[PDB]
Design a protein around this motif. Structure first.
Motif, PDB file in Angstrom:
ATOM      1  N   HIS A 119       0.858  -1.143  -0.036  1.00 36.02           N
ATOM      2  CA  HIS A 119       0.033   0.213  -0.028  1.00 36.02           C
ATOM      3  C   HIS A 119       0.950   1.352   0.136  1.00 36.02           C
ATOM      4  N   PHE A 120       0.610   2.228  -0.742  1.00 35.20           N
ATOM      5  CA  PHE A 120       1.304   3.551  -0.935  1.00 35.20           C
ATOM      6  C   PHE A 120       0.517   4.227  -0.144  1.00 35.20           C
ATOM      7  N   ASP A 121       1.029   4.933   1.176  1.00 37.16           N
ATOM      8  CA  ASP A 121       0.619   5.684   1.997  1.00 37.16           C
ATOM      9  C   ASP A 121       0.431   7.141   1.786  1.00 37.16           C
ATOM     10  N   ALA A 122       1.612   7.649   1.371  1.00 35.55           N
ATOM     11  CA  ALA A 122       2.003   9.185   1.298  1.00 35.55           C
ATOM     12  C   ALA A 122       3.057   9.576   0.945  1.00 35.55           C
ATOM     13  N   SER A 123       3.661  10.474   0.368  1.00 36.61           N
ATOM     14  CA  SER A 123       4.971  10.863   0.196  1.00 36.61           C
ATOM     15  C   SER A 123       5.277  12.339   0.655  1.00 36.61           C
ATOM     16  N   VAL A 124       6.491  12.404   1.079  1.00 33.71           N
ATOM     17  CA  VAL A 124       7.054  13.656   1.837  1.00 33.71           C
ATOM     18  C   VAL A 124       8.158  14.368   1.339  1.00 33.71           C
TER      19      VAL A 124
END
Lengths: 124, 124
Positions: A119-124
């Motif tokens: 699962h890709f949750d987010a990018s920062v």
């Protein structure tokens, strides 16, 4: 059945001036990758790094997922990703996306055995 | 069923392909348009002119189809089309294609009432 006219349209028609434009990347990829069936998935990130590098993220910095789950990890380094987001003009089944290329850290959920991103949750 | 791991790759992985690449059109389009399911379609042409301009071909120059049938029509003007051809490296389910932009007259087969394009015959 799929009528002969509608089949022709699907197989051969792509009306436009710059169809081979890079800014079309998300439209075609969001379609090729089956994320425009039934509804338009509003946002989705594509990662352009080796799968070995992405899989490695499962053994880097631990962090809490956005949904409260605790199986998330953040890449130590930034990665070349392409962000796809529906435009204010997109309406199913005519999904439209703006393509944006940036370098950000990715945050993914890992699971399974061996532990791999699920699962890709987010990018920062 | 599809594994969560495979789902991640399908939804977020795109190594070996750059968004800023005009050469990628066919691979993405052949996939988006569902002509890589079961087997790679060897050749396919996409037309970039208006649907109205293409439907009008059914009222232009009558010619014989390559298969001997007699419902084929040739456009009077050259049209902007994209030629997609399976590379020698192509191997299902890993279909590869070369993208070639061209400008030739197209020959389509017309059917139905009213008569609209139902089969792409060739470009010339």
């Amino acid at each position: 059945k799929e009528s002969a006219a509608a089949k022709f349209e699907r197989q051969h028609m792509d009306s436009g001036n710059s169809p081979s434009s890079s800014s079309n990347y998300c439209n075609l990829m969001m379609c090729c990758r089956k994320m425009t069936q039934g509804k338009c998935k509003p946002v989705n990130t594509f990662v352009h790094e080796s799968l070995a590098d992405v899989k490695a993220v499962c053994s880097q910095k631990k962090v809490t997922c956005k949904n409260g789950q605790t199986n998330c990890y953040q890449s130590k380094s930034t990665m070349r990703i392409t962000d796809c987001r529906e435009t204010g003009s997109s309406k199913y089944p005519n999904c439209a996306y703006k393509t944006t290329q940036v370098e950000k850290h990715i945050i993914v959920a890992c699971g399974g055995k061996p532990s791999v991103p699920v699962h890709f949750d987010a990018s920062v």
